[PDB]
Design a protein around this ligand. Structure first.
Ligand SMILES: CC(C)=CCC/C(C)=C/CC/C(C)=C/CC/C(C)=C/CC/C(C)=C/CSP(=O)(O)OP(=O)(O)O
Ligand SMILES: [Mg+2]
Ligand SMILES: [Mg+2]
Ligand SMILES: [Mg+2]
Ligand code: NA
Length: 344
């Protein structure tokens, strides 16, 4: 295990007023499709509180829509602990790829069926239709492509897992945004909150840098809190290999990269907001709420704090920082993502 440092976030906490209602609609959905093998698994899935992190990211969205997108994450966690990050398929790329393309296919078209399907695939069809059916054509095109990118990203993790190797810090920062599916998270934010970027904004290299920098630092925050659970491919382990230091010595380096990427995100945000349309301002607002959502929910969620729902927490929130850890405005030397700083 390791000791985490306090976190810097300059945005106020936000939660959807009708959170209690959103979670019940999700619990009803979980029980309807039986997203568990016994009551213990049901308890553990509910303890993730996936409804919360979405409600904290979507404080002004209709609760029916927050609940619909929350199912994606509930299903996510259920299939994550079963298939993606544990089990025999999680360490064989030739077994993972045939399985994972079927889930990517069902995301694109729920009417696509196969002879053998993994548990909770019926739930994947339902949440897909529930999320995408009322959405715009553009939002659906975004849902499909971002989902495939996530499933393709998780395959890349299994490759390194199969070989028992840790990827380079350059390769990790490039691919981590895909493995965490933050592009898909942003797409569900648009669908639920009822915003959609223009083709112009989405393609523009400033907004791409904004999304990728945001995506990366959001998932580095995940790595820090989820490090303990994953032991009981992480920014701590990747830095530990590359610098040949211990996990504890890789903490300040992680926070340095975290602060340098979030520092760039705020710079890009400040440049875009003045000229931003109602759709881009809504995403930026969504990105702000997500920052607080991950920290406020993450260190109160049993997933990253408890070994079982009911046991005392092994992790507590490390606290709030007034200043950033690293104020260096220079670009990171990792050439897969160094181009971000060119859009300032
Ligand atoms: C709340 C946010 C945006 C980030 C915090 C970390 C989160 C939960 C990111 C997910 C945001 C979503 C819903 C992207 C949509 C595609 C789906 C359904 C991913 C489900 C698998 C998953 C949880 C990928 C996250 S990376 P990892 O496996 O290391 O997560 P943990 O083991 O620590 O839980
Ligand atoms: Mg995982
Ligand atoms: Mg993973
Ligand atoms: Mg994690
Ligand atoms: Na049991």
């Amino acid at each position: 295990a390791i000791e985490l440092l306090p976190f810097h976030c300059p945005f106020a906490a936000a939660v959807n007023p009708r959170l209690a209602e959103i979670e019940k609609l999700c619990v009803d959905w979980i029980d309807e499709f039986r997203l568990y093998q016994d009551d213990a698994q049901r308890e553990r899935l509910i303890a993730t509180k996936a409804a919360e992190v979405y409600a904290r990211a979507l404080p002004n969205a209709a609760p029916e829509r927050v609940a619909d997108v929350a199912k994606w994450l509930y299903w996510g966690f259920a299939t994550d602990d079963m298939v993606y990050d544990n089990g025999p398929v999680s360490v064989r790329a030739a077994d993972f790829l045939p399985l994972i393309v079927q889930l990517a296919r069902i995301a694109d078209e729920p009417r696509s069926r196969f002879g053998f399907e993994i548990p909770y695939t019926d739930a994947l069809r339902d949440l897909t239709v529930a999320i995408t059916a009322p959405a715009t054509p553009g939002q659906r095109i975004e849902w499909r492509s971002t989902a495939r990118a996530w499933f393709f990203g998780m395959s890349w993790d299994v490759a390194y897992a199969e070989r028992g190797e840790i990827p380079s810090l350059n390769d990790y920062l490039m691919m981590r945004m895909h493995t965490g599916g933050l592009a898909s998270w942003a797409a569900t934010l648009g669908i639920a909150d009822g915003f959609e970027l223009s083709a112009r904004d989405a393609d523009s290299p400033a907004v791409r840098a904004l999304l990728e920098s945001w995506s990366t630092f959001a998932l580095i925050i995940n790595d820090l809190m989820s490090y303990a659970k994953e032991i009981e491919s992480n920014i701590i382990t990747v830095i530990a290999r590359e610098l040949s230091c211990s996990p504890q010595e890789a903490v300040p380096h992680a926070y340095s990269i975290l602060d340098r990427i979030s520092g760039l995100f705020l710079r890009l945000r400040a440049d875009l907001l003045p000229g931003a349309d109602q759709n881009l301002r809504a995403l930026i607002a969504g990105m702000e709420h997500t920052w607080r959502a991950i920290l406020d929910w993450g260190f109160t969620s049993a997933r990253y704090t408890r070994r079982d729902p009911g046991s005392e927490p092994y992790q507590v929130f490390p606290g709030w920082a007034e200043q950033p850890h690293d104020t260096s405005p220079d670009p990171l030397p990792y050439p897969a993502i160094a181009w971000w700083w060119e859009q300032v």
